[PDB]
Design a protein around this motif. Structure first.
Motif, PDB file in Angstrom:
ATOM      1  N   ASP A  19      27.342  19.696 -41.386  1.00  0.00           N
ATOM      2  CA  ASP A  19      28.220  19.687 -40.246  1.00  0.00           C
ATOM      3  C   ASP A  19      28.678  18.284 -39.904  1.00  0.00           C
ATOM      4  N   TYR A  20      29.754  18.178 -39.128  1.00  0.00           N
ATOM      5  CA  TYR A  20      30.179  16.865 -38.646  1.00  0.00           C
ATOM      6  C   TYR A  20      29.872  16.703 -37.171  1.00  0.00           C
ATOM      7  N   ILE A  21      29.524  15.486 -36.784  1.00  0.00           N
ATOM      8  CA  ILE A  21      29.483  15.089 -35.386  1.00  0.00           C
ATOM      9  C   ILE A  21      30.659  14.126 -35.181  1.00  0.00           C
ATOM     10  N   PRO A  58      36.411  13.660 -40.805  1.00  0.00           N
ATOM     11  CA  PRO A  58      35.616  14.795 -41.276  1.00  0.00           C
ATOM     12  C   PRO A  58      36.346  15.468 -42.446  1.00  0.00           C
ATOM     13  N   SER A  59      36.559  14.712 -43.518  1.00  0.00           N
ATOM     14  CA  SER A  59      37.370  15.171 -44.644  1.00  0.00           C
ATOM     15  C   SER A  59      36.558  15.656 -45.831  1.00  0.00           C
ATOM     16  N   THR A  60      37.212  16.456 -46.661  1.00  0.00           N
ATOM     17  CA  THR A  60      36.644  16.833 -47.935  1.00  0.00           C
ATOM     18  C   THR A  60      36.240  15.581 -48.760  1.00  0.00           C
ATOM     19  N   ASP A 103      30.109  25.640 -41.506  1.00  0.00           N
ATOM     20  CA  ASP A 103      31.100  26.366 -40.718  1.00  0.00           C
ATOM     21  C   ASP A 103      32.458  26.269 -41.395  1.00  0.00           C
ATOM     22  N   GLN A 104      33.509  26.637 -40.661  1.00  0.00           N
ATOM     23  CA  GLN A 104      34.824  26.791 -41.263  1.00  0.00           C
ATOM     24  C   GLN A 104      35.721  25.613 -41.039  1.00  0.00           C
ATOM     25  N   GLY A 105      35.107  24.440 -40.920  1.00  0.00           N
ATOM     26  CA  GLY A 105      35.860  23.203 -40.825  1.00  0.00           C
ATOM     27  C   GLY A 105      36.655  22.943 -42.093  1.00  0.00           C
ATOM     28  N   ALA A 106      37.842  22.358 -41.944  1.00  0.00           N
ATOM     29  CA  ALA A 106      38.741  22.130 -43.076  1.00  0.00           C
ATOM     30  C   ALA A 106      38.035  21.474 -44.256  1.00  0.00           C
ATOM     31  N   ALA A 107      37.091  20.590 -43.962  1.00  0.00           N
ATOM     32  CA  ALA A 107      36.421  19.813 -44.996  1.00  0.00           C
ATOM     33  C   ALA A 107      35.547  20.653 -45.913  1.00  0.00           C
ATOM     34  N   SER A 125      39.747  24.029 -51.232  1.00  0.00           N
ATOM     35  CA  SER A 125      39.519  24.485 -52.603  1.00  0.00           C
ATOM     36  C   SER A 125      38.847  23.378 -53.388  1.00  0.00           C
ATOM     37  N   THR A 126      39.181  22.143 -53.034  1.00  0.00           N
ATOM     38  CA  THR A 126      38.577  20.988 -53.662  1.00  0.00           C
ATOM     39  C   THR A 126      37.074  20.948 -53.471  1.00  0.00           C
ATOM     40  N   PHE A 127      36.614  21.309 -52.281  1.00  0.00           N
ATOM     41  CA  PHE A 127      35.191  21.267 -52.029  1.00  0.00           C
ATOM     42  C   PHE A 127      34.523  22.431 -52.767  1.00  0.00           C
TER      43      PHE A 127
END
Ligand SMILES: [Mn+2]
Ligand SMILES: [Mn+2]
Ligand SMILES: [Mn+2]
Ligand SMILES: [Mn+2]
Ligand SMILES: [Mn+2]
Ligand SMILES: [Mn+2]
Ligand SMILES: [Zn+2]
Ligand SMILES: [Zn+2]
Lengths: 184, 368, 368, 184
Positions: free
Chosen positions: C121-123, C154-156, C178-182, C186-188
């Motif tokens: 997760d990100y903070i 908070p990037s891939t 969770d469903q964060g963009a990162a 598809s890259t992740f």
DNA sequence: TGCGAAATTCCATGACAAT
DNA sequence: ATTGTCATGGAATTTCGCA
DNA sequence: TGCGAAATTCCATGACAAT
DNA sequence: ATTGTCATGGAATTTCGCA
């Protein structure tokens, strides 16, 4: 027949034109027939649309079964008739040249004009700001006939602004002189 | 410190050190063989520094600090020294959460009469509608009867304009509000003093206190939302409609509408109640006075298993209102001057101003 | 409608109309004298329009709609017609709140081994510190052992850089997020497939599901806050310190630190535990395997007095995620395709996509 | 005396310079003595400050009681000595010109250089990206002596990346030829 | 075989959040 | 195509030290 | 002086928020 | 220098209609 009640019938009429106060020139006067409670709305014209605009405020609080007026143009238009029909309000007209209402209402209407006149004089342009205190005054005025103020009959309680001084309403020497000045 | 430890080494009993253990010496350190293994007994004079080093690793509470210490040391009544330190760590005291709940809410008496007390508040900002962004909401405490006014800002000037129109009908004894700029301005204070209106304010950041009007805000937004479903949010023209609609809606617990509680008779609206058609107005008002006095009133609920109630002289902490990122959520400890009621206190905030404050925004300071 | 009403007027019994009442006629309307007074009996054919007019005044619920109607009318089983309408008012169904709570939470089994499951997760954003705004938090599910990485977004790309460093140590079976963009890029997905790592995702808007890491975020921010008290919030240099500090903090319920659960022995940090000094590594690892299997595990709590659990085929509504001002908080009704577990369902959202969704974000549609 | 344990002693050393990979030129190598677990950190120089920077990462996960190294300049500086003292880490040096450690460590260090060389060849500039997979490889390599991989000894479990192919480590005909090309 | 005090365990409370 | 978690500090319960 | 069904009442749930 | 509130719709309880 069943006893009279608040909201049974509203008597409405225009007063004016008056000196301009903050752009306004007339007062639409509404008096509940049973209680003698008065509402006042400043308007720029005695038109159907100023009437509808003001009554739309009042009828957001309470809706009369009947509105009674004279045959003023504002009140006899087909627009005004449709407005009332939409709201289930029956309209009722005094015959032309023969104004009629009730003793309570007539007297109430008399008081309103006198009190206005009384406060107009000296500051004929500042009446818009005075409209609130005028209504409290009228509505916390004891009725000789019924033994209660309109406030008490409408709400069933004493008010936080009793108007203990049943005042003059008649113009002092000074004002007669300077209302004679204004009317010159 | 090393005196006590000396006596102990030759087998002479010291209070706190159980006699049945073998207290020896090795590597220059007094030790003891305990069921858990062999622990160092530091002298009294070293203990506070030890407890502090352990606590400071991660600013841990009682057990998590003790488990560190107990890896190396033993001494009598360790947790007492641990707790003494927790009670003096400023950083822990202002950063940790409370684990004690507030005492049960009060259910203040319903105002005896219409116009005794108004509750006022702003809703917004809303999506712009004819230039308007906010709604002034005025709720009569006794009746629930509500007036609505659209404004362009939640300002003193807009408030005064609206209440001048409203007070045309009647003047209320008290107006209760929160601490929004529009109600706390000296100008608004003057407006009310000029009218014999007493201004009452909520404790800060505690909308439960304006609960009557907050709750009405909910019903207002709910009906607005419904009426605007699949239309654009042009809400200005619906305010009069919503006002009338809510003023004439039954509360199921009361069996009355706010309109009925205000006037004792329905006006010409749909489904008007006609049960007092044969009464005179006087008989109607008589029945109304009776109905008003016997309305259901809720009672204070049960206290939760672990609540606290303020005592005069207690050390308590006020929540920081809008804490910045990575900053403490609590102020430094302060003292309860006066218990106004079991949910409201005056505290001396060790500046020290007197602040009147809800217990929902207080925690009792831990470790006495 | 008017046929039924006809029979009734001449005293012939109709089912539903109690015989003991006097059903007469007046003003063209069938009436009846009821204990509450005289009510109009409308014909069947008028009733739905009536119930609708009453309901629509303020979009009221069962009782508040009934009390309006009952002012003028009586008929058999009125509430049944009222409820029928509430169940078809689209505006009420998508605007009203639920009054049924979610069923009791699951306490999923703790992962059997370190590296079975990571929660990430990100903070942030945090106050800028040396150009950095966010912290990537990676928590080992079995041990609680946590790794921290500062990032600028908070990037891939930042995520991949950090996990490439972390996975130098070991590769985990599963990474839950969770469903964060990162994490959903598809890259992740490629990065993980390339490594035999299975990606697991939380149901949307339900951080309880990432509870392991959310909870760790709390301890991270708490220690950071404390260490930064009365200094400027320069947190970048404290990340390594906080990481080490938390990894070596006892959980009181477990009596172990995450470091101990990961390695079975303390490294050279303050207050290192020394109880296995005389064991060989093999004996140490043996005791570690035992400790791992017998850790306390919480049980699912009691259901609240009025909870609901999903049944296949039930009509339910998903909460709108970010509702605009004055817009409904709920989506239109949809149907439960599959009950994955009593807290998780697949719904057909009547578009219809299949959505996997938490019951915390569902209400059962009212009035069947 | 008490049995050897992970974190008892870390053996550290530099490897390089290597061809530049993404700006980096050296690898700091840390091997835990008991387990043979290896950590690798790319640096731009074999300096005290690159050492401190890298070890600060490692010592955020786990702190050695002792660090062992040769008398490299990076490791004998007074800065490096203060860093270790601050962390309660005792420093320990092999005598000059007489490198010494343990059989396990020596062999581990041998494997590391061979494996690097083996993957350098063909793509001598892409090693930075390969550092992770190299460590997994080393750490999931079965020990003949102890009957376990470093992974198993460090964590007490099997890993999700067993390296079932105990591979060549020796250069094929092709690579010898093209590593002879690179060294030209 | 029981008592007072210390130690341990229990557990409600709250805060981490989210396309 | 998944699922809440766990530090905290008063209180409740157990254990310890002694006889 | 008792039964089945309808009507009413009860009440947990959640949402209004806040210098 | 004051303080939570109340619409909602299943469930629990009471009342109604009949005998
Ligand atoms: Mn006229
Ligand atoms: Mn406000
Ligand atoms: Mn997130
Ligand atoms: Mn060297
Ligand atoms: Mn999060
Ligand atoms: Mn508010
Ligand atoms: Zn602290
Ligand atoms: Zn509706």
């Amino acid at each position: 027949d069943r006893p009279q009640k608040p909201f049974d019938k509203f008597f409405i009429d225009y007063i004016g034109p008056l000196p301009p106060s903050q752009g306004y020139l007339y007062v639409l006067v509404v008096v509940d027939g049973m209680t003698g409670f008065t509402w006042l709305y400043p308007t720029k014209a005695p038109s159907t649309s100023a009437t509808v605009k003001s009554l739309n405020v009042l009828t957001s609080i309470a809706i009369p079964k009947v509105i009674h007026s004279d045959q003023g143009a504002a009140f006899t238009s087909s627009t005004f008739a449709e407005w009332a029909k939409e709201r289930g309000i029956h309209l009722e007209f005094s015959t032309p040249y023969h104004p009629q209402s009730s003793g309570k209402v007539e007297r109430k209407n008399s008081d309103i004009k006198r009190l206005l006149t009384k406060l107009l004089v000296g500051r004929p342009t500042k009446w818009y700001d005075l409209l609130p205190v005028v209504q409290l005054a009228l509505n916390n005025t004891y009725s000789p006939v019924l033994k209660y103020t309109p406030h008490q009959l409408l709400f069933g309680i004493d008010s936080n602004t009793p108007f203990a001084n049943q005042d003059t309403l008649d113009l002092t020497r000074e004002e007669e002189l300077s209302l004679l000045q204004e009317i010159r | 410190l090393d005196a006590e430890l000396d006596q102990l080494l030759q087998g002479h009993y010291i209070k706190g050190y159980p006699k049945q253990y073998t207290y020896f010496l090795e590597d220059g350190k007094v030790k003891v063989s305990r069921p858990e293994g062999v622990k160092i007994i530091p002298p009294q004079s070293d203990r506070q520094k030890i407890v502090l080093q352990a606590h400071n690793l991660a600013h841990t509470g009682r057990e998590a600090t003790l488990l560190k210490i107990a890896n190396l040391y033993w001494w009598p009544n360790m947790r007492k020294d641990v707790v003494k330190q927790l009670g003096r760590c400023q950083q822990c005291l202002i950063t940790n959460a409370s684990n004690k709940a507030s005492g049960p809410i009060l259910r203040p008496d319903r105002p005896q009469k219409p116009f005794d007390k108004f509750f006022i508040d702003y809703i917004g900002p809303l999506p712009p509608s004819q230039g308007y962004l906010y709604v002034l909401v005025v709720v009569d405490g006794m009746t629930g009867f509500t007036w609505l006014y659209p404004t362009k800002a939640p300002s003193t000037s807009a408030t005064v304009k609206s209440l001048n129109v409203l007070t045309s009908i009647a003047i209320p004894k008290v107006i209760h509000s929160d601490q929004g700029a529009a109600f706390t301005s000296s100008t608004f204070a003057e407006w009310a003093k000029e009218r014999g209106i007493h201004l009452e304010f909520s404790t800060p950041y505690h909308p439960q206190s304006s609960g009557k009007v907050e709750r009405k805000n909910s019903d207002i937004k709910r009906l607005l939302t419904k009426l605007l479903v699949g239309r654009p949010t042009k809400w200005y023209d619906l305010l009069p409609v919503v006002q009338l609609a809510l003023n004439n809606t039954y509360s199921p617990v009361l069996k009355y509408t706010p309109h009925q509680l205000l006037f004792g008779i329905d006006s010409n609206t749909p489904f008007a109640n006609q049960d007092t058609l044969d009464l005179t107005r006087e008989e109607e008002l008589s029945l109304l006075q009776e109905i008003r006095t016997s309305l259901y009133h809720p009672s204070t609920p049960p206290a939760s298993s672990r609540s606290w109630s303020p005592v005069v002289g207690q050390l308590v902490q006020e929540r920081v209102a809008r804490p910045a990122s990575l900053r403490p959520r609590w102020h430094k400890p302060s003292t309860v001057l006066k218990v106004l009621n079991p949910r409201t206190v005056v505290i001396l905030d060790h500046l020290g101003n007197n602040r009147t404050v809800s217990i929902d925004n207080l925690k009792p300071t831990s470790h006495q």
